[PDB]
Amino acid sequence: TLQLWTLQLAPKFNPYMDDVLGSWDKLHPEALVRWTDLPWGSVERKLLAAVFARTAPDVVNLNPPFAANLASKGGLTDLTALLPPGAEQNYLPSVWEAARDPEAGQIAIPWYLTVRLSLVNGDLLRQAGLSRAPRRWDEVPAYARSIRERTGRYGLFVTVVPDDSAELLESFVQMGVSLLDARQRAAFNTPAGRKAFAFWTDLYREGLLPREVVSQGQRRAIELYQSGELALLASGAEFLRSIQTNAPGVAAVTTPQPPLTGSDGTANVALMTLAVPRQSQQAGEAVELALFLTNGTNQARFAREARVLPSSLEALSAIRAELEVEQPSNPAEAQIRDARLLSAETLNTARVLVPATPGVKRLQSIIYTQLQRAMLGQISSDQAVLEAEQQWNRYASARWP
Ligand SMILES: [Zn+2]
Ligand SMILES: [Zn+2]
């Protein structure tokens, strides 16, 4: 009677669903969960089948910028009225607020989150003559020079594909660029924004970035790092554990380090939420399922198995204490432990730089497109800024007259 969709969920996290949905099913025999999985490659296939059956999920996972986009078309329920009293106080406030669309309300409930680190290939680093690894975007151009010229490998990968990861968009925010103002108008036509556009335009033209950044998404950065062809990757403990079995030695060479952060030192948080579509006649039961999946006990389980961080304050403090007591023996276990502590301790100064803001996902595709043209030599960086501003304000003028 309850439809649960997990969108683009790694198949490694599958045995957990059977363990939690097992708990829910014995706890609620009269409201069993029909789990539908939509991993990469079968998303279009599955969604379209659901369109042709006029069926929708009661609970589904989304990232904040994506939820706000779907909330703009009236597809998500505002949960503030369906929540029991005291629920919001179980979650990290900064994270709970990030799942709040300023124009639609609480459209989702926080689930797990990940503070991605800088996984540094210490081998390529020494091949280039370096001892430290960069920690502020200012230090990146020179680092990218050393790696590329003195070792023939690329120093970093950040996609510029309009519809993929926002890591690049996040870097703008870290470098002090404000994307939208109060009236939902463009706010990046500023000295800080022109520096950001040029920063990436220059890195690509200079040849210090892989040519594929404009044609392939962040999944190629993971392929390149596994191949020993990338010096730095933005990820964390769970991926690091996959390397220890797939392509080890690249793991024996990797060391987790604090993430590339702006001059204000705030790293990024990647938030996964749960939302309840408005076309649901069990919205109250759906919210009960979402609050169950995201309670302290289940979050603490998941944070361990998936090596992520929970949004529950209770589970968070439990994970921390479970790490401060951890005393590993293998140097691999200490590598994984070192990464989870880094993300945990970095969480204090970390924020969701791209929250559930309406139009921001659309703005991302506008910025990446004109940025592509800039780094491909068609236009300038200062010209890409203006063209992106004009093109966005043209849209905002009709969406928010
Ligand atoms: Zn509200
Ligand atoms: Zn991607």
Numbering used by the authors: 10 to 410
Paper text:
We report the functional characterisation of a modified sugar-binding protein, MsBP, from a marine Synechococcus strain, MITS9220. Ligand screening of MsBP shows a specific affinity for zinc (KD ~ 1.3 μM) and a preference for phosphate-modified sugars, such as fructose-1,6-biphosphate, in the presence of zinc (KD ~ 5.8 μM). The presence of the additional C-terminal subdomain places it unambiguously within sub-cluster D-I, associated with a narrow substrate preference for carbohydrates.
